[PDB]
PDB file of C-alpha atoms in Angstrom:
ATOM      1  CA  UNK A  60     -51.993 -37.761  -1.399  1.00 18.98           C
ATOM      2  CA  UNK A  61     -55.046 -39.206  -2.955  1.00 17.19           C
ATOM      3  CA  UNK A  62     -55.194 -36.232  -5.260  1.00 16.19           C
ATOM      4  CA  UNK A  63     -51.747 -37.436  -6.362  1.00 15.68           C
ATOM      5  CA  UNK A  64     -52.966 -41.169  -6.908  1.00 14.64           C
ATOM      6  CA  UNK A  65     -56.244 -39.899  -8.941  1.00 14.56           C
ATOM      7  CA  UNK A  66     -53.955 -37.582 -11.292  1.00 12.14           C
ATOM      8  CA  UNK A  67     -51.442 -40.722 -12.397  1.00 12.88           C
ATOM      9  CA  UNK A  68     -54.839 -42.413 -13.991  1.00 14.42           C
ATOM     10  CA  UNK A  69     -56.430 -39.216 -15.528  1.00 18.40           C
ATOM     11  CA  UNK A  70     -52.903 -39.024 -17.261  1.00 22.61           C
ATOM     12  CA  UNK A  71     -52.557 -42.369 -18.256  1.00 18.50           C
ATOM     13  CA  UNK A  72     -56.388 -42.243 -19.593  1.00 18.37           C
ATOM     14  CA  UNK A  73     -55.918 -38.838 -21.233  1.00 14.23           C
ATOM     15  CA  UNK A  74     -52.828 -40.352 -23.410  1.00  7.64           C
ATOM     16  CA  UNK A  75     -54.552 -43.632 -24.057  1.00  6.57           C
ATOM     17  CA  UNK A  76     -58.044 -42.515 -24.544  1.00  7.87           C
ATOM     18  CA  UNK A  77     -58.097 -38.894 -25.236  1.00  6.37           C
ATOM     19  CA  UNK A  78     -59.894 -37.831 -22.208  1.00  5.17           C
ATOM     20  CA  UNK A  79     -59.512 -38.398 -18.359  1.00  4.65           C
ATOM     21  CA  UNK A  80     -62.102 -37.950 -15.156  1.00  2.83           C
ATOM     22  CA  UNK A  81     -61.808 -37.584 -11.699  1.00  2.00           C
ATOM     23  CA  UNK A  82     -64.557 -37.962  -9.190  1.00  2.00           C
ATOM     24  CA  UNK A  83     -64.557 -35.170  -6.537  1.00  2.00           C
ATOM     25  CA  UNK A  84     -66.196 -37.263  -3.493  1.00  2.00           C
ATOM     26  CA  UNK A  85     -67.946 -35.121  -1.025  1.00  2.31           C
ATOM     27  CA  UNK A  86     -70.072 -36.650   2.219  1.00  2.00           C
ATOM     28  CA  UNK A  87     -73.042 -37.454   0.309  1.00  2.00           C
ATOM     29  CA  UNK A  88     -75.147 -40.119  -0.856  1.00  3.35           C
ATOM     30  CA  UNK A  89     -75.015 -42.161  -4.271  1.00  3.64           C
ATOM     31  CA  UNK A  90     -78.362 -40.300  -5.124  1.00  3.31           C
ATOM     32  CA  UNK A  91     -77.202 -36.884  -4.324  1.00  3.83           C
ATOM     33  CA  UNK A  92     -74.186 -36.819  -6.976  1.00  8.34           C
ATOM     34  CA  UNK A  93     -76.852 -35.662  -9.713  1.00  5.23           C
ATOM     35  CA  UNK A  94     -77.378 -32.316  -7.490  1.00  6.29           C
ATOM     36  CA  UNK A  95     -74.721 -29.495  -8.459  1.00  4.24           C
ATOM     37  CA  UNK A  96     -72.528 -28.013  -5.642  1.00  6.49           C
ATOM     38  CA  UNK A  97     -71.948 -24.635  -4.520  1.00  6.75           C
ATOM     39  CA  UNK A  98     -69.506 -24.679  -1.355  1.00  8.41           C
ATOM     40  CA  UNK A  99     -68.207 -27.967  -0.082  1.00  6.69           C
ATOM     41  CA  UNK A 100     -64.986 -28.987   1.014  1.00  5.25           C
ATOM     42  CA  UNK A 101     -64.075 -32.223  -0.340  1.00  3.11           C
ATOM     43  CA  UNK A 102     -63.483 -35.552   1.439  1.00  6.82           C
ATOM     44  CA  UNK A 103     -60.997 -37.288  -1.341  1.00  8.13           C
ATOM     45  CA  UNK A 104     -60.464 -37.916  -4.975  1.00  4.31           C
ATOM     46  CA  UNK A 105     -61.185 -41.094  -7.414  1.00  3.73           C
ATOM     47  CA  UNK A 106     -60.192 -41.513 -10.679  1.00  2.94           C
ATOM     48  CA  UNK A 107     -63.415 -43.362 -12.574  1.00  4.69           C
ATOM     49  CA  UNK A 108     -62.388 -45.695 -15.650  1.00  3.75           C
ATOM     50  CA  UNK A 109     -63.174 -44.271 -18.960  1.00  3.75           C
ATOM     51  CA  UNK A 110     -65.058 -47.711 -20.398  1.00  2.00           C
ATOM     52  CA  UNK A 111     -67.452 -47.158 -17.278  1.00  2.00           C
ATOM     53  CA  UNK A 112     -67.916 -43.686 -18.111  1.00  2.00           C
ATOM     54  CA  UNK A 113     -70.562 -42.334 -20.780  1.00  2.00           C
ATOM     55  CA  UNK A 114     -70.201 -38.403 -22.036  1.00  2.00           C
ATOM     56  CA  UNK A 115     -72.726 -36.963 -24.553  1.00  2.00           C
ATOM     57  CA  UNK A 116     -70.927 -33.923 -24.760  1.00  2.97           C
ATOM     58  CA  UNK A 117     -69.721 -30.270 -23.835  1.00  3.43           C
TER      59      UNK A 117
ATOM     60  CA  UNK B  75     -82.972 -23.204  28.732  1.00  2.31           C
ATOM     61  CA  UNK B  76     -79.917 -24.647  28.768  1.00  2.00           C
ATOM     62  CA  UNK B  77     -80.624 -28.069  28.101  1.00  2.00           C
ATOM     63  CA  UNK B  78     -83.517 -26.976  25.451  1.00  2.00           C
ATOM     64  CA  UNK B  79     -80.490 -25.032  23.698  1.00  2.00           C
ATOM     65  CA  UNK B  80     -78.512 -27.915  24.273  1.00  2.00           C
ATOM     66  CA  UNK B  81     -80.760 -29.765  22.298  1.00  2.00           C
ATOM     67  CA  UNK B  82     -80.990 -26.983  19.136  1.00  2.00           C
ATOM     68  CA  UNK B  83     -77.414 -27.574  19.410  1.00  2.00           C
ATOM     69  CA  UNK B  84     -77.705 -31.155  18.661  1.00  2.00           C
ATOM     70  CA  UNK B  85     -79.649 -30.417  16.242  1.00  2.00           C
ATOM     71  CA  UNK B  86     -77.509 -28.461  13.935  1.00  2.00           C
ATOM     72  CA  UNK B  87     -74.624 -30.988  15.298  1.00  2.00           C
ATOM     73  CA  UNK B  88     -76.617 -34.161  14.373  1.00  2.00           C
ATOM     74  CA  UNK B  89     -77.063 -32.474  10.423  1.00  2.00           C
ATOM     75  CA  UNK B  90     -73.762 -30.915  10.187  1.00  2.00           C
ATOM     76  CA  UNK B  91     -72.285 -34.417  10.640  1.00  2.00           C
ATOM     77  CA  UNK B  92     -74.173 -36.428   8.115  1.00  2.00           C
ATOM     78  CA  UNK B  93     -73.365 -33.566   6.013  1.00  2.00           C
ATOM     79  CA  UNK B  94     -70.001 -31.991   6.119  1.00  2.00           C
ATOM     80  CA  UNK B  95     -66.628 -33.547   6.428  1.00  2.00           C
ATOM     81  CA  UNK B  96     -65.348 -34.869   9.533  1.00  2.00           C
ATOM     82  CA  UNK B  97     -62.765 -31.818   9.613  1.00  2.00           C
ATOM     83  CA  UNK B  98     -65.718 -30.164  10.982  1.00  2.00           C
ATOM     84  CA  UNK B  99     -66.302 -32.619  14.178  1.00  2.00           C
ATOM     85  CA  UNK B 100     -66.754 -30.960  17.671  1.00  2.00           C
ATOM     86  CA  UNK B 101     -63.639 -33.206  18.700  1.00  2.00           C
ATOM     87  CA  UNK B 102     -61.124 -31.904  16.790  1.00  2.00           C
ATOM     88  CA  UNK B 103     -62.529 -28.487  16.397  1.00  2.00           C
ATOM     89  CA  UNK B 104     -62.138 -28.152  20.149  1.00  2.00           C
ATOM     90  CA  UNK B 105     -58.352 -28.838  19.920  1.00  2.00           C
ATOM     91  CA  UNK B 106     -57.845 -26.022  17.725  1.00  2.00           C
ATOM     92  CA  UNK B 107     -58.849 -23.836  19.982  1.00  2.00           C
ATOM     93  CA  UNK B 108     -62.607 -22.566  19.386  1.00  2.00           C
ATOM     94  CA  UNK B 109     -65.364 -21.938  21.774  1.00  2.53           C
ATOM     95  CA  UNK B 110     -68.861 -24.333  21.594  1.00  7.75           C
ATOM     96  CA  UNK B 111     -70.688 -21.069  20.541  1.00  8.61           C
ATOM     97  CA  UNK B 112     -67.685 -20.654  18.142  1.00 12.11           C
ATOM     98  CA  UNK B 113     -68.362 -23.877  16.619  1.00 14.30           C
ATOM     99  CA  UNK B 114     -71.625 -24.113  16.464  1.00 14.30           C
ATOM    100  CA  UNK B 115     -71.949 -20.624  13.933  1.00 16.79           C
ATOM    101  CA  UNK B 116     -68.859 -21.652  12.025  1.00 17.55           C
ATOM    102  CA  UNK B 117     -70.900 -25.022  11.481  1.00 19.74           C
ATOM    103  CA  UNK B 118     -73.968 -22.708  10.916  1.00 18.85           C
ATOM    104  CA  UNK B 119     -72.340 -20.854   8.135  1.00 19.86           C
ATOM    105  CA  UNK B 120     -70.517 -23.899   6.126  1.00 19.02           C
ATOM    106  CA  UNK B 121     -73.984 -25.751   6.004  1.00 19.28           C
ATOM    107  CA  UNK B 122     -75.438 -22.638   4.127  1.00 19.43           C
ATOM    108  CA  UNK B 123     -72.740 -22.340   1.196  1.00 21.24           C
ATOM    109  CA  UNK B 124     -73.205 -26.296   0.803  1.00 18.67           C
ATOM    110  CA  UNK B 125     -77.263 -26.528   0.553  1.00 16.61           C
ATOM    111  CA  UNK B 126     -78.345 -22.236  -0.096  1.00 16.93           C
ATOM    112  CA  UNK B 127     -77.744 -21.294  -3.548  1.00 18.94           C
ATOM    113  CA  UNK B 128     -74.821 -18.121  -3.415  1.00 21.63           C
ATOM    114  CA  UNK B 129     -77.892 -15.813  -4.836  1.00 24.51           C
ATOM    115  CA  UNK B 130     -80.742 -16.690  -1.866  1.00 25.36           C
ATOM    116  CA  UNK B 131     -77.024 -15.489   0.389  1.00 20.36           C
ATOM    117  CA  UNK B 132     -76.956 -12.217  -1.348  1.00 22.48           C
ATOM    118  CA  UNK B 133     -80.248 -11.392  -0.472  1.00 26.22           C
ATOM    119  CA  UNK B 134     -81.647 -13.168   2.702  1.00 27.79           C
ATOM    120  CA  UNK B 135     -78.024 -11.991   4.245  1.00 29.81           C
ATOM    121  CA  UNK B 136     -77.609  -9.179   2.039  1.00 30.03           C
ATOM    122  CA  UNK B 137     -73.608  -9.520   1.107  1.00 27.17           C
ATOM    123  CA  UNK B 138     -71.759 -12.558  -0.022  1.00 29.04           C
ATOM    124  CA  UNK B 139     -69.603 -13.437   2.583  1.00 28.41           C
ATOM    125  CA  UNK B 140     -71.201 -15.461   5.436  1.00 31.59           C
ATOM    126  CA  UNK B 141     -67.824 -15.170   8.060  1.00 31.32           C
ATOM    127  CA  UNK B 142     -69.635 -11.627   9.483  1.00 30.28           C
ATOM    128  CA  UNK B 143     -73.405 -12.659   9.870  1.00 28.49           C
ATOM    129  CA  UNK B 144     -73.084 -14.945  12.626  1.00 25.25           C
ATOM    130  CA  UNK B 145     -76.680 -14.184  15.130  1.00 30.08           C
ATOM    131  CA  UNK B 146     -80.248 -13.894  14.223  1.00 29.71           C
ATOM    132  CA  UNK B 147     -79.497 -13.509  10.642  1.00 28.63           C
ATOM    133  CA  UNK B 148     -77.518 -16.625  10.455  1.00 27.72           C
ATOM    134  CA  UNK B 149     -80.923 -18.582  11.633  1.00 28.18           C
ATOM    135  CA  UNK B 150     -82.605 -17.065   8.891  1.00 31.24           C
ATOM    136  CA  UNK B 151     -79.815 -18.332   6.737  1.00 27.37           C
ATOM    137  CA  UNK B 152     -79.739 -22.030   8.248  1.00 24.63           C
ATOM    138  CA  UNK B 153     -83.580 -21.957   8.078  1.00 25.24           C
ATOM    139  CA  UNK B 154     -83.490 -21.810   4.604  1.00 29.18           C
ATOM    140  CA  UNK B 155     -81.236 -25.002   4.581  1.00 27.75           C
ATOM    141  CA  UNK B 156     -82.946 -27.101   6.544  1.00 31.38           C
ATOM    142  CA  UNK B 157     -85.836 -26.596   3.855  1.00 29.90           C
ATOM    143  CA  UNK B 158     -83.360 -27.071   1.330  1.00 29.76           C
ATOM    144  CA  UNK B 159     -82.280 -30.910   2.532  1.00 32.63           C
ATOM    145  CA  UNK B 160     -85.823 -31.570   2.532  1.00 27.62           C
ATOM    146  CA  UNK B 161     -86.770 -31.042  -1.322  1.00 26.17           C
ATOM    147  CA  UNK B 162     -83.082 -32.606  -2.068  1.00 24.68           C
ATOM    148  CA  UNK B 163     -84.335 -35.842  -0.643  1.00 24.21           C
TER     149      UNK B 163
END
């Protein structure tokens, strides 16, 4: 369900902007989104507003 | 022993919860139908993938998958992650 909701905004950003993100929120901290993952189930899915959003790059 | 195992127990129970998703939770684990020792090493195993790196698996544990490892080996295994929380923070 919240997969659903996250997907109608990376859409929506994708034709607007050219590019669209979705956060993948696991049970961690603020601090511990820098880490990578290996193995984690996820709790939920939010979509994260492309002016908000700074990419340097592939 | 039993309430000093009891207490290991907690342990792993007190990190597994601040850790992995509620799906996980002794409550609700019990209704589907698994045993406490059951729990505990399926709670052992899911806290390795998410802190030990896939490679440190292949060789502490020696193969890949962690759903066959379940004993002595495993507290090697969970060691390792309970040294591996420490350096993240």
């Amino acid at each position: 369900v919240q997969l659903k909701n996250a997907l109608l905004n990376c859409i929506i950003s994708y034709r607007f902007h050219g590019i669209g993100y979705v956060l993948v929120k696991t049970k961690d901290t603020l601090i511990d989104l820098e880490q990578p993952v290996n193995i984690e189930l996820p709790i939920g899915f939010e979509y994260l507003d492309y002016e908000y959003v700074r990419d340097l790059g592939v | 022993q039993l309430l000093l195992e009891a207490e290991r127990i907690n342990e792993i129970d007190t990190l597994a919860k601040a850790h992995l998703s509620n799906h996980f939770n002794k409550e609700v684990l019990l209704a589907k139908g698994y045993t406490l020792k059951d729990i505990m090493q399926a709670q052992r195993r899911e806290l390795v993938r998410k802190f030990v790196p896939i490679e440190q698996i292949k060789a502490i544990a020696k193969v890949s998958d962690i759903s066959h490892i379940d004993g002595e080996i495993l507290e090697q295994l969970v060691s390792l992650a309970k040294v591996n929380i420490k350096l993240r923070k």
